[PDB]
Design a protein around this ligand. Structure first.
Ligand SMILES: Cc1cc2nc3c(=O)[nH]c(=O)nc-3n(C[C@H](O)[C@H](O)[C@H](O)COP(=O)(O)O)c2cc1C
Ligand SMILES: Cc1cc2nc3c(=O)[nH]c(=O)nc-3n(C[C@H](O)[C@H](O)[C@H](O)COP(=O)(O)O)c2cc1C
Lengths: 359, 359
């Protein structure tokens, strides 16, 4: 089975093509992770996936989505990851991390606590920053503060520091969060970026924050460990052909700038869209990016059906299959998938104290 | 659904009728548990079961089954359980522990490392003790040393110390391991107990080690926390009606001596038996013990099919359903069961960071 073939990128070898994508847990306190995350992540690593990408981890306090978000904006925050990284490695999975800044979508409630911007008089909230002083709208009505050039320099440096910290905590894979309407995505999109300086207007200018951040991170991130990003390549906003063409051009520039793999997603930059949700609906778009940018890709949404993951790999739509919610339902999804696809000794997807009894 | 009704025993309330029975992991070193067990157990607790019973934990070094077995024979061993107990509680499951002594079946290899008695010249092995100097046979050929009265007094005290330690580590439920051919079971069975002193011969004498151990433990175990035992009530050795009659009589004496619930199993005292394995095959025997001893019971073997667990409860064959291997396959089995049985808001079997997204 294609799903259970190893994958090598730079000096890192994944034992199979199952990636667990970043999934926010909303369980940190002042950015500090705790035994929620330790047990969650170590348990997932033991379930058999080849790569486990830690949830969106804020490069700066105001770049959290919510008061429960993980952070890596100080060395103490970074050191909290060390035992978890070591546990993921002990289980044979590759530890990755997504580093992030929520931009105008920051200062929001947890999804089961309203999912909306935090009220103005709530002591937990904070001012958001963005390319331009324009609200997302809907349940995220707060108008962000327009970033100064010094704010841009500071956030770039925050990404560099975060990557340096991730490296020194022992992560073997990094993902820059340039998707989902957060800060990076919002610099790229004309919907959110109305700047008239070097960071907005033209395609080169809208690309600039993302490319400069990638280049700055590349200076501290080891050349022998995969350097990746998540990026929303279309919005389903009636401008899809134009948007995908620009997004593919940016992917070519990312590749030229050292990006090893792109996690292909949707922008979610604005609320007024019509996304055609369905199982593996991203497969064809990911394939197009892969082909036109000649860059390895992953994508997500509905690949918890093992046959669909297998089909996408066999068709060369993707290089890795990201499986999210199915892993919240069953930490041992990889074992389920191995059984479904007829892998020999499927139970040995799991460690011996489980595998011996399930064979 | 009966499976999702709470259960109260003494001062402890389980949120549902799913028990995770003790399952040896063979991952400890010199009896000390480690992050294998922490993550394993905390992850199981978060999966939704009402009760999580920690694996057979040796009361003394020679009472381990294998070199990988957990122990509780010193205060340092006990203190290693404290963070795990606290994590199980934080997840809303009741933490229990099975305390044990492997008797003649001790000094064995891990199941995936031969499963047999350790060779005589292997530096990991040790002399086994038992009621009588008679080997199990088959893959456990070692002849144990016949216990002296002082050995019996010492092992009883080892059980007391283990129970005291479990109490002080924060366990809310204890299970004495008097099943599966280990020390306690082997005192009860005429196959293994050929003693002619106060601890063998008659039914009263063969019962004596078990009853004295229970009484000694009861002196240190809080009256407001469930005091339970696992006991093999028949062997499938051609003497089943006689054996079950004696075993039920012992269960009545256990109840009279403060036992709150009996986990009903098979003896496994000798190898030459013919066990009629099948889904829920223990249900009718557990029901008979429940009825004839008027004592709550649990049992195991094949209850990972949720409808079978539900049927056994509705028929009053059991009070709790023990689900073992299905939890090694899927730590979140309780969520699977809730969906299968049509429980409203089934995803909220799990904690919010999972439940919100699976609803
Ligand atoms: C609980 C949860 C939290 C998520 N947090 C993030 C995140 O931190 N970063 C990100 O890029 N995507 C995040 N996502 C998106 C997932 O990575 C993934 O793309 C999505 O769940 C679709 O895959 P699935 O159908 O397999 O769940 C999150 C999804 C879920 C369900
Ligand atoms: C990995 C493993 C280890 C076990 N270790 C113990 C143990 O520590 N104590 C015990 O009384 N039974 C032990 N058992 C028996 C289980 O508690 C249970 O009765 C058995 O697995 C049948 O239930 P199931 O069909 O749901 O797995 C073990 C079973 C397994 C699979």
């Amino acid at each position: 089975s294609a799903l259970f073939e190893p994958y090598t990128l730079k000096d890192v070898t994944l034992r199979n093509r199952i990636a667990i994508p970043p999934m926010c847990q909303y369980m940190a306190e002042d950015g500090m992770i705790n035994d929620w995350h330790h047990v969650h992540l170590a348990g997932l690593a033991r379930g058999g996936a080849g790569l486990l990408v830690v949830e969106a981890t804020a490069v700066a306090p105001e770049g959290r989505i919510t008061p429960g978000c993980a952070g890596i904006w100080s060395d103490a925050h970074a050191q909290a990851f060390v035992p978890v990284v070591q546990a993921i490695k002990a289980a044979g999975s590759v530890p990755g991390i997504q580093i992030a800044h929520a931009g105008r979508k920051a200062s929001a409630n947890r999804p089961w606590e309203g999912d909306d911007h935090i009220a103005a008089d709530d002591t937990r909230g904070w001012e958001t920053i963005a390319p331009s002083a324009i609200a997302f709208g809907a349940h995220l009505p707060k108008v962000p503060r327009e970033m100064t050039l010094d704010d841009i320099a500071r956030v770039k440096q925050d990404f560099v520091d975060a990557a340096r910290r991730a490296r020194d905590a022992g992560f073997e894979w990094i993902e820059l969060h340039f998707a989902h309407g957060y800060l990076g995505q919002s610099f790229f999109s004309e919907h959110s970026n109305k700047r008239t300086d070097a960071y907005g207007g033209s395609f080169d200018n809208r690309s600039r924050f993302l490319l400069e951040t990638l280049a700055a991170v590349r200076e501290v991130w080891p050349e022998n460990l995969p350097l990746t990003a998540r990026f929303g390549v279309l919005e389903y906003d009636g401008r899809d052909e134009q948007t995908l063409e620009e997004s593919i051009e940016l992917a070519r520039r990312f590749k030229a700038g050292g990006l090893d793999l792109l996690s292909v997603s949707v922008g979610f930059t604005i609320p007024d869209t019509n996304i055609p949700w369905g199982p593996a609906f991203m497969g064809p778009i990911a394939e197009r990016v892969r082909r036109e940018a000649k860059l390895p890709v992953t994508s997500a949404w509905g690949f918890g059906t093992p046959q669909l993951a297998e089909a996408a790999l066999q068709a060369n739509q993707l290089d890795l299959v990201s499986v999210g919610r199915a892993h919240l339902a069953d930490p041992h999804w990889a074992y389920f998938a191995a059984k479904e696809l007829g892998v020999e000794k499927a139970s040995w997807t799991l460690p011996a104290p489980y595998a011996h009894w399930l064979e």
